Ligand binder design. Structure first.
Ligand SMILES: [Zn+2]
Ligand SMILES: [Zn+2]
Lengths: 244, 231
């Protein structure tokens, strides 16, 4: 690569586990981020700056004042402007040497499928159970990893699902499809909490793409209130509508 | 608190643990963020969007290409501009309704003690063992809570030291980095500030360590050193 790119990616390249090799891998890698909010926003911000070759940002909503408290990528001046655009645009100003696509739609059906297909890794950053479900289905089908997370109030939840599908899919831990019983406090959310969650979704994407020994198949839980971390093991359904 | 304000802070206000009581508290607080790097950058960003009344951005340095990989608050286009200025400007675009004071200088001795005094919580975001040491001194002198962090390669470190100074100060205790690893640490530094300024209970007498490769946290029990030169 370049002698400049070296400087920019200096902090990663200088790392044994990544070095020049991985750094190229990152540059040759592609990542799909469905949803650019308090979760996908810092996810995209850190991936671009890390040098992920390609980034597809999908989000069908505009920038609202209500967002600025946790969706750090945006600015008040961006209000009413479509997220995907504003996003790609600002990420560009950060890392021009990388390609950024902006889908101003809702990824579904085949539009979501092939989109998933390509991607070497797919981050789910839609705090939506339905979407998350088909993103999972699609991911399982076109054997492409899914790194899903979420947050409500002071609580965070993260999960990495690799293609081998060892410990099953999201439709294993929740063969259902409706909603969880955390539907109560679904009122607000602390920025740092949803933030740390997305940021971690990116660390997991890097490690996955740069082929690092990152444990998966867990369900990490964060309690922003007690500032305590916790992990629940996983194992697939003895006959899931997927992963079967 | 008008229509606009209710709207931006709405996801925080609709929270039992904060509501108008806390949102109001945040808006009356001042936080000193010393250092605007991989740590300070996301911290300032999350605190501002949160609505902390006054933010003092300290940092005697300019943007560099190297930076852009972990310091998410800057772009290539600010490459030679000073950070405190660039931060101050970008943060205002996010929340014009809060007090944002830049500090293109380098705090030390008195210049530091003043800033620490006029500040509810101080965030040590200077990955420099030295500045760090002076701050811990100032923070204990003016019994001002100190949230400090670190992040090297794949491992981060976090600590919340408060006034009763029960389990020690930073003395009582004592070059590549992954983007997200410093981030997590910084974002968490904000989380602790918001919990401290809003009044939420937070076990703090420990040294949280994060290993971003194995993806697991560990803690060490702090202890105020016998005859510590500050405690
Ligand atoms: Zn399954
Ligand atoms: Zn001490």
């Amino acid at each position: 690569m370049n002698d400049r790119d070296f400087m920019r990616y200096s902090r990663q390249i200088l790392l044994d586990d990544i070095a020049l090799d991985g750094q190229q891998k990152l540059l040759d890698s592609q990542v799909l981020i469905i949803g650019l909010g308090g979760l996908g926003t810092p996810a995209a911000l850190y991936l671009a700056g890390a040098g992920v070759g390609t980034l597809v940002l999908a989000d069908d909503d505009d920038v609202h004042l209500s967002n600025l408290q946790r969706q750090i990528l945006f600015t008040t001046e961006d209000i009413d402007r479509p997220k995907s655009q504003v996003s790609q645009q600002r990420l560009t100003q950060l890392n021009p040497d990388i390609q950024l696509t902006a889908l101003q739609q809702r990824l579904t059906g085949e539009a979501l499928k092939d989109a998933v297909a390509r991607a070497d890794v797919v981050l789910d950053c839609t705090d939506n159970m339905a979407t998350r479900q088909e993103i999972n289905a699609a991911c399982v089908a076109l054997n492409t990893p899914l790194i899903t997370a979420s947050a409500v109030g002071f609580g965070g939840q993260l999960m990495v699902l690799t293609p081998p599908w060892e410990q099953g899919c999201y439709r294993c831990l929740w063969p259902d499809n409706q909603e969880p019983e955390r539907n109560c406090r679904t009122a607000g959310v602390v920025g740092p909490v949803v933030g740390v969650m997305g940021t971690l979704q990116a660390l997991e994407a890097i490690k996955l793409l740069s082929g690092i020994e990152t444990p998966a198949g867990e369900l990490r839980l964060f309690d922003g209130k007690s500032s305590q971390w916790r992990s629940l093991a996983l194992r697939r359904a003895s006959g899931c509508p997927v992963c079967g």
